[PDB]
Amino acid sequence: HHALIPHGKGGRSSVSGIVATVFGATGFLGRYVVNHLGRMGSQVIVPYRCEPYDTMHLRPMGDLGQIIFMEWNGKDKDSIRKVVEHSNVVINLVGREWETKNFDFEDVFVKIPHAIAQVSKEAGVEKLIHISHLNADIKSPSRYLRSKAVGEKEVRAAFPEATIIKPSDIFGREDRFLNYFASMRWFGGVPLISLGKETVKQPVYIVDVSKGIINAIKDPDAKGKTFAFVGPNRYLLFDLVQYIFAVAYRPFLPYLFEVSPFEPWTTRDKVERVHMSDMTLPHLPGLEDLGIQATPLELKAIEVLRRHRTYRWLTSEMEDVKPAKTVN
Amino acid sequence: RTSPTGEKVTHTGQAYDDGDYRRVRFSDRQKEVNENFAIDLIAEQPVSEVGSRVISCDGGGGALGHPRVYINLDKETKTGTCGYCGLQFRQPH
Amino acid sequence: MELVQVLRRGLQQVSGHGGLRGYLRVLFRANDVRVGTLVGEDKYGNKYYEDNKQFFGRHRWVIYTTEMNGRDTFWDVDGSMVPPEWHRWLHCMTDDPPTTKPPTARKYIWTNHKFNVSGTPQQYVPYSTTRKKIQEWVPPSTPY
Amino acid sequence: DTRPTIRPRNDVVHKQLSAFGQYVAEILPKYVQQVQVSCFNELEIFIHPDGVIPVLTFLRDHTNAQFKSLADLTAVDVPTRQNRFEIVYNLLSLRFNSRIRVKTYTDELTPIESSVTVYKAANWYEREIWDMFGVFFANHPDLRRILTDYGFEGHPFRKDFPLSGYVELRYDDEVKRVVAEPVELAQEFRKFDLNSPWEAFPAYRQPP
Amino acid sequence: KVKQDMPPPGGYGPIDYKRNLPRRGLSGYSMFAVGIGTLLFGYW
Amino acid sequence: ASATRVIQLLRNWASGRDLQAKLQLRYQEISKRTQPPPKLPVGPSHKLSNNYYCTRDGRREAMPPSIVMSSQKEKKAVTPAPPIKRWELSKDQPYL
Amino acid sequence: SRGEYVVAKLDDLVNWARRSSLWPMTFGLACCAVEMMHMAAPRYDMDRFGVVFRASPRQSDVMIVAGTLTNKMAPALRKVYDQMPEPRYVVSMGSCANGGGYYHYSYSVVRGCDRIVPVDIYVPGCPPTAEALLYGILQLQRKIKREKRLRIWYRR
Amino acid sequence: FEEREKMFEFYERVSGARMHAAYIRPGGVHQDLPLGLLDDIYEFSKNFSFRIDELEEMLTNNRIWRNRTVDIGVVTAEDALNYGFSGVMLRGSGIQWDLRKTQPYDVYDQVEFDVPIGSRGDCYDRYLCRVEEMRQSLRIISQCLNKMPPGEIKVD
Amino acid sequence: TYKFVNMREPSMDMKSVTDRAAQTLLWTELVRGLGMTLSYLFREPATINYPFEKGPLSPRFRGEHALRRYPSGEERCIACKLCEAVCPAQAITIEAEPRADGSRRTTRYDIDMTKCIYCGFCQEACPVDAIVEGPNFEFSTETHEELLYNKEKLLNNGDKWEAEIAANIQADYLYR
Amino acid sequence: VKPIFSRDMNEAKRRVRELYRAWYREVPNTVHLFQLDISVKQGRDKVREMFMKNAHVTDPRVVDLLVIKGKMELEETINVWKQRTHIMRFFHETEAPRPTDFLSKFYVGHDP
Numbered sequence A: 001h002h003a004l005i006p007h008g009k010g011g012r013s014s015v016s017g018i019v020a021t022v023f024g025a026t027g028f029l030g031r032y033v034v035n036h037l038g039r040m041g042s043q044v045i046v047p048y049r050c051e052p053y054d055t056m057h058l059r060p061m062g063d064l065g066q067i068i069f070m071e072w073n074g075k076d077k078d079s080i081r082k083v084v085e086h087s088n089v090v091i092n093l094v095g096r097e098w099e100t101k102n103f104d105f106e107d108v109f110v111k112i113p114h115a116i117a118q119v120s121k122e123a124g125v126e127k128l129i130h131i132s133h134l135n136a137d138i139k140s141p142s143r144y145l146r147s148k149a150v151g152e153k154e155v156r157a158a159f160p161e162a163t164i165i166k167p168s169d170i171f172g173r174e175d176r177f178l179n180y181f182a183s184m185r186w187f188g189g190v191p192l193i194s195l196g197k198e199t200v201k202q203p204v205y206i207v208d209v210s211k212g213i214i215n216a217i218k219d220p221d222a223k224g225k226t227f228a229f230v231g232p233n234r235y236l237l238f239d240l241v242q243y244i245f246a247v248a249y250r251p252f253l254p255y256l257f258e259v260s261p262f263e264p265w266t267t268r269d270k271v272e273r274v275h276m277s278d279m280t281l282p283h284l285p286g287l288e289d290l291g292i293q294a295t296p297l298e299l300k301a302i303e304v305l306r307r308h309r310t311y312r313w314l315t316s317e318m319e320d321v322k323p324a325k326t327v328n
Numbered sequence B: 001r002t003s004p005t006g007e008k009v010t011h012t013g014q015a016y017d018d019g020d021y022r023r024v025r026f027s028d029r030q031k032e033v034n035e036n037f038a039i040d041l042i043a044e045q046p047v048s049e050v051g052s053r054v055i056s057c058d059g060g061g062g063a064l065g066h067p068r069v070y071i072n073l074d075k076e077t078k079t080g081t082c083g084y085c086g087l088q089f090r091q092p093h
Numbered sequence C: 001m002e003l004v005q006v007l008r009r010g011l012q013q014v015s016g017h018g019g020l021r022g023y024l025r026v027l028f029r030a031n032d033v034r035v036g037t038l039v040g041e042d043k044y045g046n047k048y049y050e051d052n053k054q055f056f057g058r059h060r061w062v063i064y065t066t067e068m069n070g071r072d073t074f075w076d077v078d079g080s081m082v083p084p085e086w087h088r089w090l091h092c093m094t095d096d097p098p099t100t101k102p103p104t105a106r107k108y109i110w111t112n113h114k115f116n117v118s119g120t121p122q123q124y125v126p127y128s129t130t131r132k133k134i135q136e137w138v139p140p141s142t143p144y
Numbered sequence D: 001d002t003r004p005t006i007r008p009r010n011d012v013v014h015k016q017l018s019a020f021g022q023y024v025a026e027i028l029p030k031y032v033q034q035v036q037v038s039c040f041n042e043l044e045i046f047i048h049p050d051g052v053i054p055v056l057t058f059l060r061d062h063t064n065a066q067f068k069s070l071a072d073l074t075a076v077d078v079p080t081r082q083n084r085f086e087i088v089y090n091l092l093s094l095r096f097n098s099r100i101r102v103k104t105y106t107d108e109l110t111p112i113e114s115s116v117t118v119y120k121a122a123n124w125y126e127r128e129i130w131d132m133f134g135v136f137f138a139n140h141p142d143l144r145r146i147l148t149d150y151g152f153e154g155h156p157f158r159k160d161f162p163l164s165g166y167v168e169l170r171y172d173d174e175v176k177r178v179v180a181e182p183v184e185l186a187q188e189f190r191k192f193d194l195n196s197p198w199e200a201f202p203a204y205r206q207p208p
Numbered sequence E: 001k002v003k004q005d006m007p008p009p010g011g012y013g014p015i016d017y018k019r020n021l022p023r024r025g026l027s028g029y030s031m032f033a034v035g036i037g038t039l040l041f042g043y044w
Numbered sequence F: 001a002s003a004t005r006v007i008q009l010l011r012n013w014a015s016g017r018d019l020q021a022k023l024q025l026r027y028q029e030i031s032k033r034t035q036p037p038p039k040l041p042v043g044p045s046h047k048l049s050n051n052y053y054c055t056r057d058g059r060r061e062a063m064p065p066s067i068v069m070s071s072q073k074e075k076k077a078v079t080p081a082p083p084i085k086r087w088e089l090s091k092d093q094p095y096l
Numbered sequence G: 001s002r003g004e005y006v007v008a009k010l011d012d013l014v015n016w017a018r019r020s021s022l023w024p025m026t027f028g029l030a031c032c033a034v035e036m037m038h039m040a041a042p043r044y045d046m047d048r049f050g051v052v053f054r055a056s057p058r059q060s061d062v063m064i065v066a067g068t069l070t071n072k073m074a075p076a077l078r079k080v081y082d083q084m085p086e087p088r089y090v091v092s093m094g095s096c097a098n099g100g101g102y103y104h105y106s107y108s109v110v111r112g113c114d115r116i117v118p119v120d121i122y123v124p125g126c127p128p129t130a131e132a133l134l135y136g137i138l139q140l141q142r143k144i145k146r147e148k149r150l151r152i153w154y155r156r
Numbered sequence H: 001f002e003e004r005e006k007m008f009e010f011y012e013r014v015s016g017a018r019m020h021a022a023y024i025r026p027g028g029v030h031q032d033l034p035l036g037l038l039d040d041i042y043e044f045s046k047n048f049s050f051r052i053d054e055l056e057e058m059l060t061n062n063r064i065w066r067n068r069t070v071d072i073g074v075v076t077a078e079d080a081l082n083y084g085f086s087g088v089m090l091r092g093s094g095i096q097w098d099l100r101k102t103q104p105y106d107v108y109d110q111v112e113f114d115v116p117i118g119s120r121g122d123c124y125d126r127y128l129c130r131v132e133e134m135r136q137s138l139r140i141i142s143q144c145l146n147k148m149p150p151g152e153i154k155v156d
Numbered sequence I: 001t002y003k004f005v006n007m008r009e010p011s012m013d014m015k016s017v018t019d020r021a022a023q024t025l026l027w028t029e030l031v032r033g034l035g036m037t038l039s040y041l042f043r044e045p046a047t048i049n050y051p052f053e054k055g056p057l058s059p060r061f062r063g064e065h066a067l068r069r070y071p072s073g074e075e076r077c078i079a080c081k082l083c084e085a086v087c088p089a090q091a092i093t094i095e096a097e098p099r100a101d102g103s104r105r106t107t108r109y110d111i112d113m114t115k116c117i118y119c120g121f122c123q124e125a126c127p128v129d130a131i132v133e134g135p136n137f138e139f140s141t142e143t144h145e146e147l148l149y150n151k152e153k154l155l156n157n158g159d160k161w162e163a164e165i166a167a168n169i170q171a172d173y174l175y176r
Numbered sequence J: 001v002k003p004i005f006s007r008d009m010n011e012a013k014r015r016v017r018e019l020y021r022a023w024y025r026e027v028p029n030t031v032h033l034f035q036l037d038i039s040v041k042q043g044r045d046k047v048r049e050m051f052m053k054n055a056h057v058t059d060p061r062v063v064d065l066l067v068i069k070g071k072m073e074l075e076e077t078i079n080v081w082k083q084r085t086h087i088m089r090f091f092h093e094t095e096a097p098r099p100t101d102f103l104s105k106f107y108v109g110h111d112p
């Protein structure tokens, strides 16, 4: 029904015929996804629950009448219906790394995704892009990963052709993974369980994940396939943190926050997930399947961590830190 | 008038179709529609009967109207219609 | 002396706004406490006053209504609340109040002036007023 | 003719300007190619481009030609001529309360001598001419873009340059900077053909 | 008849167009004398 | 202005000029915004006779620039114009 | 509830402070800056509303883009905007700032400051009359008054 | 600036826009003056001289103002001509040049005024020149208000 | 013809030198300026009480564009499109088709106020006084899309402001 | 025709090499000055690419003007007259790659 012929040169004023409802657009991955849709000329329907002021960053990402902001409630199915009725593609990015007063990991990673998928199918949405985690497992101890996998199964049940993506520790300018390690100063030295010597993580670049999502939407065979976005290289957690502090000009000092009512600095599940080595699933399609070539962390490391410089490393000395050893 | 979708039809005969994605723009905002259809309004206006074969209409108000045009009423079945105003004039039978 | 006259005039202004309560009300709703002849009041409730003694620009003023078009305006005095007919007199376009010289009545003219609805759910959304230009071909519904 | 509609014309100034144009041509036969006085009393001297500095220096220092003020230095791009760019110098003589125009021609490659030595005001004018049209000025103290963007490519005022340009600017969150992207107009500039099919001025008719 | 906005019969009145900055204050000798007198009274 | 005589005197003394004579704020010398309907006049060519446009077509009476000299196939010295006359010092106020 | 009542009242207090003491920075670029000055002129006197022209952008809350944002000036506008502290609001004054106005099809004019910086209030006109600009600021004040930042944090 | 606001009203009364008027059009002016406009112009010009004098009272004789202007940015007359300076720049250095006098246009030949001429070429003299130009402008305005002829406002 | 600003030699009379030194030492001129500002303090402020008090405006004021109707109720616009041509910013987009009755009625009258320069050429060009800039200057929006005015928006603006627009035209049509 | 600066192509090539040396040596500083995320090799690769783009020119006059324009860009880069975005504009990043295969262009649009 809502099929639009793409017309234009793929610019801001062009028409790509992608009416997309990017759930959780006001987020780290959300911004890049909206920007890619906006630069192509897509009708990005933005459902938001926060203040409209917090959504202003998404306004300049699209041409006039291309970014539509409408309020939605995760506890209201009707809100989901009115925000995906005219959409031909729905992207679900709703996920909080810490539980809240009225939203628990189950609600954010099972209940809300399932409601979106069920409503989208009833509305007739062509494609759904759910965003899981690579380490998500039904029997994983962490509630975060366990709940994410539970919702992933329910997403497939409601939306049979849903294209589920499982990124692994996305890194970027406004990321909660690289910046989190470079914020160990608040947490004394560098709190590392067992010096983080048994954890190998595979981080993925933010743009790579976002471009993959856009490519998945265009890809005609991506429907119904559970993609897993893996990083270019696997780094030892200790080496990765050493590299992070190195380019951030931070003294490497190798070495409760859930209570904080404001956004928790650290979560028990986050601590477990940080010290949990990233899984390796070779049976799932990756970025190369979608055509996106993985970008090494080294090239984009400075863009995320130069801003965390202390006194004289972004200039003057400007010592070049060599790439950290990769456990590959 | 209102479309089957529930969207009021403009006097320009425009109504976003059910399959039209652009209909989302009125999701939480009203669709500005003028509620005085001009075509209906002139139809209300009565047809003047002027004995003269040729009459001139300026739209009323002189300089506040439209360029004066002279209308011929020879046609018996048809009624002379102002080019600008649209007012209909007839010659009494 | 004239100072006593000034103070007495201030007390007169206090009385003229309908007691201390009204005096404070106009003080905190309009930040002005001078009185003037009530030229007229629109249907929405805004009251218009004129004092020729005041210098040009403050000779005419409007006290906005508390409730207009189902909106509380006790503190939110929108500048677009002024009805079109009073707009001429208030903005000094004409020297004739609409009460003295009513504007010509036309059926198409609105019966309820609406303030700027930007930011409200009744805001105007742009759209095309034309129809589809190129009609497409309909495939036959009967299998060959 | 007469009556208020017609503009009054002063013949005395016309005669004076014609005489002075002949004066300049006689003094500088090496460079002066043509001398014209418009019907609205504006003397114009056409000079070979090699004579930019000599002719201007004569028109500035000569006792009977004290044009010591460079009013405006501009260029006119006519693509139908081999020397498409036409460099026009507008001068002012306070001593004799008169103005004169020195018009020269140049190509897209042939350099033109800078007149900064003659008039110090020529600096920024020639910078603008180079930036907008692309006319290189030899021996210029500092010839660089003065009005366009720093990284801009192309000369905008050229008749072959698109009005909307080739590139547009916008802010991109992914790169966290203002980026340049190919121009895409939501509403194309509607070209209006207004030239009437009927001749308007018989006096300026070009015979076939 | 023609009713353009025109100068009134007889024209408008005169308009000041020159600097009016007046002369105020005592002479230099007098001002210095006043200051010195205040000083002398203070001293006494 | 509605100011006490004392305030007026203090204001004038501080300024050094009679401010009440020329107050910047406009009170009543302003012209009435509502004015009588005007009757603008017609131009010199609003006539029913001797009004042929050929006699008043200044736009079509322009001519191409006259070519005084073209390189393509005792005189006295000539100035562009008579030399400018020295300006004369103002008589209303010679020195500001 | 009591918690909602406390949060709502505190949010209203915070909203009142910001809207009452808005500090704008004059990003005067073109003709519209002149009318902006006439807004601060005695007749209208934006300071009467608490809106005092803060020269320092580091101590400003509202950026009034007044004029034609050219391509050459475009990077500076964004860089100044991100150096503004939050909460920061952008008010676009004039058709040139809104969508390019007279120079929309120019080769070196940004097609509206909305592309470079997110805009909150658009003031129409060329130039918008000082009252219209004052009206826009008051509309921004009402916009701030409607904001419920704390309430949403509590109801999160 | 309040006086500038009053003059902006004169623009709006005759054109309908405060700053950009498009009133002077090739061929004349768009419309005739609205009845009563000339009278208000006379009232403003009558009290405008006092305002200029008040400006001089606060700046002209002030020693701090002189220190910031006297012997600052001195331009030799010959340099000004060679550098293509015009207007106050030429007059500031003593060059007796003014297009309204040397090359009269419109009916400037039918008005009588005086051209302020500097003596030192510093900023202070140019400041005095600009002030005096305002004074002489009132002189021209009074003449125009008393010589405005009857007729059409556009070429027939 | 020319007046000598400055160019005033100082008298070296001992009295004149004394007064000059008095000005320098006793800071007389600074006190004079201070007194001038003090005088300005006791004047009446010129601030109008917005929005309760509005600034003066003339009937020729140009503001929000509006499409008018004949007294019968028919749209004056007869789709001549010359207002589209005259518009110096190319802001008006007009598409017209023969109406069911058969008159020249536009199917699209779009003007983006974000591109319009509020020149007023459109109202001067219209031969039926259909498009007339209204008196409303306070129509600021919060989103760019709102500025782009549809034909329906223009018709509604005309219907809202018709009384004032007609009164102003009646008060100014003689001048035009 | 009067040569702009170089009478012969060999003289023009001398000017080209001089400009290339200056650009090659400036690239490391430019990355430091504007804190660019490109590598020194990347900048020097771009410099060579830009020079190689205009490698089909045969007129010494055109080569001279190209060198003059190249000098002007270098002057702005050295004098920090350009901004970080201006330097990055050489490296087209946000612009989506337009394919060259006819079948791809056929799918993309009506592009000729």
Ligand SMILES: NC(=O)C1=CN([C@@H]2O[C@H](COP(=O)(O)OP(=O)(O)OC[C@H]3O[C@@H](n4cnc5c(N)ncnc54)[C@H](OP(=O)(O)O)[C@@H]3O)[C@@H](O)[C@H]2O)C=CC1
Pocket (backbone or CB within 6 Å): A023, A024, A025, A026, A027, A028, A029, A030, A031, A048, A049, A050, A074, A092, A093, A094, A095, A096, A097, A103, A108, A131, A132, A133, A134, A166, A167, A168, A169, A170, A171, A176, A177
């Ligand atoms: N490195 C990573 O961050 C990785 C994350 N993922 C998953 O992919 C997604 C990436 O999220 P990202 O864009 O980084 O955003 P963030 O996790 O940084 O911020 C949370 C996002 O989810 C939305 N959200 C969270 N809880 C709710 C709720 N209860 N109701 C509505 N919206 C909610 C937020 O919108 P709002 O602020 O308005 O509430 C915002 O868009 C998440 O689902 C995440 O779990 C998977 C792999 C790696």
Ligand code: SF4
Pocket (backbone or CB within 6 Å): G030, G031, G032, G066, G067, G068, G093, G094, G095, G096, G097, G101, G102, G125, G126, G127, G128, I117
């Ligand atoms: S909108 Fe009009 S007044 Fe404002 S900057 Fe643009 S052209 Fe100038």
Ligand code: SF4
Pocket (backbone or CB within 6 Å): I076, I077, I078, I079, I080, I081, I082, I083, I084, I094, I125, I126, I127, I128, I129, I130, I131
């Ligand atoms: S000029 Fe008037 S009649 Fe013609 S299209 Fe425009 S609004 Fe309609």
Ligand code: SF4
Pocket (backbone or CB within 6 Å): I065, I086, I087, I088, I089, I091, I092, I111, I115, I116, I117, I118, I119, I120, I121, I122, I123, I133
């Ligand atoms: S007033 Fe001017 S800018 Fe506005 S629509 Fe008319 S012609 Fe265009």
